């Protein structure tokens, strides 16, 4: 169906991590 | 050994403790494959959580918080072990420590826990993390700490089943207003990503973002020097323009479309594709929004990508074209025809993505139904480029909606 669409798979894949370890 | 560390950590003497907990922290922070499972299976977690209570030894609190942070950086099983040891209330306690390193490390650990999922996010929220977390944002805060704070904010905004509570969004948005005027690149990227998770949460969350007044500050970042900021901003405003016409119009009112020539010609195919996705949500709007895209001189660039872009971009450009026919006027569709939309539009009738084929057929159907007198001209254009034969072939397609529409187009417009 024609119309507006939510963000598609494969888009904007460089997202911030959900988790980070503190490494030294 | 781990047995040794656990034995020394469970002492009642805080020096022996400190020694052992620092050893565990080192094991957990010396490389990118830490032995998390082995330290969980040693029993150390309730000991570390108890260490967190020792306001008399800040160094011990800090080492335990670092150790627990890195354990909680792993899989959901490992984060959840941390959560089940009762770490969260103690980390929230340590948000008020007078010692900066303990405070920051507590922020970090809670970031990993909130990031695990929406119910962990909401448990930490319900215990009151947001007000003390936002109380750290000040002119004097060190920039590394502020970056960790705004990363945690990203995690408070993300996940959608359910999305964060309305009250939490209301508390976070003023902080995002403050932080979007920052110049540090990581702070900007994280701020804009937090906003983009909010604008993907629902039309009411979009409305909250709009009502905060932050959109005019968000739109000009589409031309930021840093491509990570650019793409984050494209996601944030793109999510907005998935909403209603009024919500889309808030974005258009900031002159968003003037930023797109540099995105449609960007070397990166993924940015071309994302930009066309945005514009296809614009052309699905009312006549005035279609006209805004036209006036902004973007149609030739869209058609050029429909012809010569990578296939992903071409699919998005097909959506842009077809969506324009939802509410577009006859004259606007005629402008598309003059710009040579037909041949590259029709070239997509043969691909294996049945969705794209349906989209293009829907667009061709609306175009023909709209061009009262010119329907013969447009039909001859479709025939010229081989589109008519492709419709005839689609009469044999597997998909009922497709071959139905192909029969119908041929009967209604190519059977005289």
Residue numbers in the entry:
A (entry chain B): 419 to 442
B (entry chain A): 72 to 487
Sentences from the study reporting this entry:
Active transport of proteins from the cytoplasm to the nucleus is mediated by a family of nuclear transport receptors known as importins (or karyopherins), together with a number of ancillary proteins including nucleoporins and Ran1–3. Importin α is constructed from an N-terminal importin β-binding (IBB) domain and a C-terminal NLS binding domain featuring ten armadillo (ARM)-repeat motifs. The W proteins of henipaviruses share a common N-terminal domain with P and V proteins, but have a unique NLS bearing C-terminal domain that is recognised preferentially by importins α3 and α4 (KPNA4 and KPNA3), rather than the better characterised importin α1 (KPNA2). In this study, we present high-resolution structures of importin α isoform adaptors bound to the NLS regions of HeV W and NiV W, providing insights into the molecular basis of importin α isoform specificity.
In comparison, the importin α3:NiV W complex had P1211 symmetry, diffracted to 2.3 Å resolution, and showed more extensive binding, with residues 421–446 bound to importin α3. However, there were marked differences residing outside this region, with importin α3 ARM repeats 6–9 binding HeV W and NiV W residues 419–444 and 421–446, respectively. Notably, despite binding the same region of HeV W and NiV W, importin α3 exhibited a 2.4-fold more extensive interaction buried surface area than importin α1, with 16 additional hydrogen bonds, and six additional salt bridge interactions, consistent with its > 50-fold higher affinity. Similarly, mutations predicted to disrupt interaction at the importin α3 major site, K437A/K438A and K437D/K438D in HeV W C-terminal domain, and K439A/K440A and K439D/K440D in the NiV W C-terminal domain, also failed to interact with importin α3. To further test the involvement of ARMs 7 and 8 in mediating specificity, we designed an importin α3 mutant based on the structural data to disrupt interactions in ARMs 7/8 (N348 A/N352A/E387A/N394A), and found a marked reduction in binding to both HeV and NiV W proteins.
